Every structure is written in structure tokens, then in C-alpha cells.
């Protein structure tokens, strides 16, 4: 959170990448480290590989790197996922009055609909188009 | 609640006055982050983009989602309504 | 908790000479008249 | 402290209006307390069972009865926001300035949870607005700290 | 492509004189302009995050950096301007 | 010992001056509507050279003189372990 | 597998009501089930 | 969008993109679910993507109303948008 | 150790349940959090699911969720086992 | 009209000429106040710098923080540019908001040939930055022995 591409690369992405070895049917690896604060390492396997096991191995190596990652990065929880890259579908959610703002709806979708779609067998990845609520403390430097 | 956060006591002064979190910041409920914002047909939206697990069945999976979703509908707040803006599946079904 | 949400587990059987799908159907029917925001699911043997 | 005493305890906290009536006919205890000193009056007050409270109070129940931690049913009613139960207790003799072991009055608790209607009623029955807890706080204090503008107006 | 980036150099000597903690500098700079996830809270029965950060209006401009104070060990507040310096430069937003 | 320092102080310095900081940005979301500038804020980076580590400031005495890391240690690139040496036909080597 | 004729039921908080409200919906569903001893028998909470 | 643009800039485009589908291709396009804040490739603040579902194959008779024609026509038009890269394209048979 | 049912649920049970995604062939997931400090969470899979696979998937997710739990809980650890209410036998060992 | 800022940066030499010939402001400034001269200096396009200078580019253009294109070439070791800018007018004693001379910048980054060129054009060696450090102070603390002695 609040980190730049270089800080993310040299503090996470590289550390992870360096623990990736002895992983069967691995054709290649690619990663992006970016300015939102985000890494996205994609290990791609020989066609025919058991995805379940490719996940188990990758994650195994990753557990080695994990405590070398910074607390904040751990605390956001890192994911490991075995999905296709493309979107299968986008499930859109609106409010046909105007009793709920865009923020409001996103929080609904997140705390009420997402987890269960996330747990549905077949569902590689769920991207929330928006953000779940958080208790925001917005500081003022003068008062501080 | 926000009310409860605002009430947290940062320090008690030399004179005895209280400094509360509300006295140095705007407590408020709002996003984890503010990078993603959707509209549906111009109108304020949210939603979830769904990627099919490796090897999993497109059509079968889609079904499971519509089934789970349907369990959610009855408990929606007033006005809340699901829409179906992008879906790779119905082409498969229709075309077969 | 059950599938993510808070819950309360309820047991019972069909009365003498009734089927379970009957006793179930009534529970299902009886549950519909519960306060808004309250839902219900069938777990365990009942799920099956 | 008896077969029916405990039975009554059960019935009041769950608010089985009828079972109470019967036990009342049967002479079940109105001073039956559990391990924390709660009588069926406390139980009915905490849980908001108006009929029972009225019933128990007719049968000589102690309205200023008090838990091992000094708290009377009025506290529990005021704190948990049952206007009707508060009025009854008060009308039926309740002490409006009763202080639990921490010095906390029923005014205090209503103030904290912001049940203003309860506050007015307690005020109307002459609650000491200046009374203060072990930490020395008034119900006005509770109000300004919580930032209840409406409530602090009343408490002036 | 690369973009302008605002580089702040924390003067280790100047900080060390005033008695300001480098931990204090970096957290202050970081929470305010980046956001920090403190802990969780419960919001209508679901666990969610608490975030601390600067109100939008105090993290908009390069001039705002000097408006943030950190407390030195002697109790004095010290502007971020007493111990830092700045320049524009070009970094990447997406390293492959 | 001449500078009244321990390995502990050396470590602390290295942790504070060989840091890589998430610093935030200018014009980050949520922005004040009408902001024009979006740029990342860069603070400290990881040191890259033997010299940069040499400069690490351990302390400054009353008389103003500055005690650097190089004033208490030799500073070079050398392996994580010196336990394993290979020769190939008795000539210096490494290998997999 | 427990009991044939037996069922396993989950009451679920689908809207952030909390414990007190859920105990209440439970109470209601139990009480309204006790008023059909010809279909529902021995309908009980599993928890404490 | 170019280097260091903002939500506002991006949204403005998204609006024009959404606008085009809603006004010019209303005879063909059912929905436009558009997001500000990412796009397949990148993920920033100068980034956006738009999911678009068409009305059924029946109410789109002929080559001109099928996707290849629509997306070429959309892309062509979208080129006239000042200071951005706006592409409309069909997803292929095998995504791989 | 020493937690009440709510503390357990709100710091542990929810966080874990919240992270049980992407696991394959789930049917349902139930959990109890009690006054003794203990939580159990039971994930129950389709008939014919490889229990080894199901168990590793569940644990891989728990692993990832681990840094989100309190100190005193990661310290105690969180065990993940197969559910089998079949004992071959029970050996009692008493002192007379 | 600031296709010029872009083309400077991009290093396209004709594109700078052609938009220079079509009128576009030599002193066009991007969000941080960089001119096409700032850009060309930082990217090290010597050819662009000359052209911009022919057409009367403000050689001492300042950015929101107050650094000049001279400041950049010094810090980044583009020698030819340091010369060209110095010739064409550049305040060799310039200070950004932190009290930072191009000497300080070239000093800290150990670009010794540039230190001399700045020195030749009369750069103040006792110039203190906002912290009171001189270019010598920098070299002594960077432990650069060559540079240190060159500054006397």
C-alpha cells in the first residue's frame, strides 16, 4: 500500500521470483510490479499439467519467500490462483432507485455477495469492481 | 461505528482538556481503496469480474454462480438489482 | 456460522408416520414467515 | 433457590407470559436470584418483557433489587432502551438515583446509549443530573464525549 | 512510459541532530501520503479494515510536504522541511 | 569501542539508511476534484554500492565530527558464506 | 448419517442483524414449529 | 491515457466512450459496463476498460451490424479523441 | 488462550472464512467459535473429491491467511485435518 | 501545441525542428514546469538543446522546485550540454529550493570533468545547500579523494 513500482519490485517481486525453482512443466514466468503497489507473477505450465499440483508447488516455494516480504505486504494477504486470464463474465450490480451511492453498492457487493461467489467451485478469480468499506481516518496535519 | 472511532482519546492535556481522534481527523466510512469505479449504462454501478478456474467448465460454472446469486436476491436492500453486462457463456449455449 | 454468515443450527425429525420431505417442506414454509433478513439453508443429511 | 424459583427465572428471561402467570398463581419466588444476583425482575428488564415486569411487580417483586455488582433493574431498562419498562418501574417505586458499585446511575447509562426519551422520563422523575461516577463524570460529560448534540442540550 | 516522480531526500545528519526518529519520518511521510492499514474493526458483523491517511487536501501539492510535522525526542515539532529536500525525476510506473 | 558503539548500533543504522520506503504519491485517490498532478513520491531506496554503505552515518559527536560506518568497518562485496571453495584441475572455479 | 425422518436446519443472518435478532428469529421459528406436532417433532437448537 | 493523467481525465474519455455506444450504436449495443482504474495491460489512474454486450444476433442483420464492423467503426471514431489511446476489439476464438 | 466466543470469532474465525476461496469442490462450510478459546471450521466437499487434494487446498489458503491472525494464535498454530469420526480403538491409560 | 515537450523528451530531431518552425512556444511547460530544455537536458539530447537554444529558449527556466536545465546535465553527467548551456548564458550559481547548485549535483554524483567546467565558468565553491554543505563537504563525505582535492 502506497509503494511505487521500484519499491514493489525490489522488495517483493524479486524476492518471490528468486524462490521459484524446481517446479515441474514450467514453460516460463512473467511478472509486473507497478505504481499502485501491486505485483502479478504469472507462472505458465506445459499444456497437460495438473493445475492443482502446479498450484501446490508454486505455493510451496512461495511459503519460503513469504516471511522475507514486508509486514504490510503480508498483511494485505498475498494470493495464489489458478485461473484463466480472461473474464468469464462480469456480474453487474446497480440500484434502480438512487437510495445507494456507488460506494454503498460496492460495499454491499463485497460484504454480502463476493465471498460466496469466490467460494464457488469453478471460480478461479473474483475481481471487485470497486471497494469494500473501511473505517477511514482522514488526518489533518494542522490539527495534528 | 464512526462515532466510536472519533471518541478515541489521543492525549489528555496539561490543563485537563481532552484530545480525541475526531479532533484531528475526519472519521468516515469509505473504501479500502479508491481506484476502481464502475458505471453501468452511464448509471452508478459495482460488480464482480469472474475468471474461470483452470480447467473448470465454463457453462457449468456460470450456472453455479447464477444459483448462488439467486440465494442472495431476496435479502437485497430496496432498489438493488443484478444486471448481466458481459457474459461469454450464452454464445456457447446458443451456438451449440 | 454457515457459509460465511452467522447462523443457528436447528435439528428435528418428521412426526410419527410423516416423511422428511414433508417435515422439511413445512420448516421451509414456516421459515418464510420469519423476520426480513433471515434466511435458511439445509445442511448435512438434509443437504444430501 | 427452589424448583419454581429457578423455573420462574427461566420463564421471565424468555418472556413466556403464560408460564409466568401460572408460576405466579403457584407462588413461585419473586426474589429467586441466579449466581450474579439477577432476579426475574432484572431478567425481564434486561430483555424487555413489559407484561412480565408488570406482573412481577404486582406480586411483590423487589424493584430496587440489586445484582452482585450493585445494579438494579432500572439500570438495565434505562441502558437497554425500554421506555415502557422504565416508566413502570419508576411509577412502581424504583430508585431513579441508584448507583451501581461504580457509581453509575440509570441516568448515566441512558445517556451513554443516547436514549433521550428515557433520559427525559428519568429527568421527569427527578434524576440528579449532577451525580457522578467513580471517575467523576456526569451524564452531560458522557454526552459531550460521545458528541450527542441533541442529548447534551437537554442535560444543559 | 516513464513519468515525473517526486524524490524526497531525508537528511540523516539533520534528522539526527534534531532528535527526530527516521522511523518517525518515514511512517509520518508514509501513512499520510500513502495510507496505512492499522487494524480491523467490525462493521455490521463483518470484519473490515481501518485505514489512516491524509485528507485529500493535505496530500495534493508538492508544497504540502512541508505542512507535516514529526515530534523530536525533546518534544519539539519539526517541519518536514527542516530535514528534507526535493527534485523531480523520471521513474517507471510499470516495471516488467 | 573508540566511538562507543556496538554491532547493535551498526545494525540499526543499516536498517534505517538501507531502507526502501513506500512514500505515497501526489494526487493520489481519493483526490480533491480538479487535481492536475499525479506523481509517485520516492523516498529512500536500497543502497547499491560499497561506498553508499561506507557513508552510512552512525553518529555525530558534540564537537561536530561525524562517525561513519567505514570508520568502524571494512566494507566490501564478498559472499554470504566463505565455506565452499571449488577448484577445477586445481585451478580456481565455481560450479553448479 | 444421524436420523432418517430427521433433518438438519440452518437459520442464517443474511443482512447483518446480529446475535439478539437471530436468537429471536430462531425463537419464533421454534415456537411456530411446536404448534404443528403432527409434522414437526423434537425440533431443537443445536447450540448453547 | 498518457503519463500521469488522473481519474478525471480518464473518466472524461470513458464518458465519451460510453457516450458513443449509447448514442451512435444504440441500434446495436445493449449494455456498456465501464470501469475507471484498469485495462488488461496496465492498472493505474490513466487507465480504463469497457465491457460491451450487443443486442441479439437477430436485431443485428448483416455484416455492418456484426462485431467486426462495429468495433472497427468504434475504434475509427475513437481515434479522434484528444490525448488518448482508445481501442475497441473483438475477443478471439481461442483466447490463448 | 483465554478468549471469549466473540473475540475468537471476530479475530480468527471470520478472517479464516474470509480467506477460504479458490478451493475446489466445496459444498458448504460451517464453523463454531466458543467460550473456551477454540474455533473449528469444517469444509465439506463433494462426494468423490480427493481428500488429500482438498486438505492441501484448504491448508494453502490458511497458510496465506495466517499473518492476518493475532500473535497469540499464530503462536499456537492452527491445525488442519481430515474429518473422520471413525476410531479403530481407544486405549485408556489410568493410574490405580 | 506542446507536441514540442513530447518531441524534445522523445529525442525526435526533425519533429522538434518542424514544430519549432511552426511557432510553438520554446518555453512550453509541463505539469512540473519542465521546459523542452529541461527535458532535452535530462534525457541528454545534445542536438535538441542547440536547436532550442537557437530559437531563444529560456536557458534558466525553473521548475516547480526551482531546478534549471543546467542543474540536470550537471547531476547527470552530460558534459557537452553543460558547456553549451553555460556558454548560452546559464547561471552556474543557480539554486533550487533546497539551496542546491549544479556544482553540488555534479559533485555528489562524482562527475569530475563537469565539476571543472562549472568551476571554469566561475562556480562558487563555498555555496552551502540548505543544510550548510559545500561541494567539498560532499566529496569528503562521499569519500571521493580525486574530486575533494580538485575543490580548493
UniProtKB/Swiss-Prot annotation, chain E:
Null mutant phenotype: Loss of susceptibility to contact-dependent growth inhibition (CDI); inhibiting cells still contact the target.
Subunit structure: Homotrimer, with large domains that extend into the periplasm, interacts with AcrA and TolC. AcrA may be required to stably link this protein and TolC. Interacts with AcrZ. Part of the AcrA-AcrB-AcrZ-TolC efflux pump.
Signal sequence, start to end: none
Protein name as catalogued: Multidrug efflux pump subunit AcrB
Subcellular compartments: Cell inner membrane
Inducers of expression: Positively regulated by MarA, Rob and SoxS transcriptional regulators (at protein level).
Family: Belongs to the resistance-nodulation-cell division (RND) (TC 2.A.6) family.
Superkingdom classification of source: Bacteria
Protein task: AcrA-AcrB-AcrZ-TolC is a drug efflux protein complex with broad substrate specificity that uses the proton motive force to export substrates. (Microbial infection) Involved in contact-dependent growth inhibition (CDI), acts downstream of BamA, the receptor for CDI. Its role in CDI is independent of the AcrA-AcrB-TolC efflux pump complex.
From Swiss-Prot, chain G:
Localization of this protein: Cell inner membrane
UniProt note: phenotype after gene disruption: Loss of susceptibility to contact-dependent growth inhibition (CDI); inhibiting cells still contact the target.
Coiled coil segments of this chain: none
Origin superkingdom: Bacteria
Induction of synthesis: Positively regulated by MarA, Rob and SoxS transcriptional regulators (at protein level).
Family: Belongs to the resistance-nodulation-cell division (RND) (TC 2.A.6) family.
Function, as annotated: AcrA-AcrB-AcrZ-TolC is a drug efflux protein complex with broad substrate specificity that uses the proton motive force to export substrates.
Quaternary assembly: Homotrimer, with large domains that extend into the periplasm, interacts with AcrA and TolC. AcrA may be required to stably link this protein and TolC. Interacts with AcrZ. Part of the AcrA-AcrB-AcrZ-TolC efflux pump.
Protein name: Multidrug efflux pump subunit AcrB
The organism of origin for this protein: Escherichia coli (strain K12)
Gene this chain is encoded by: acrB
Range of the intact protein held here: 674 to 721 of 1049
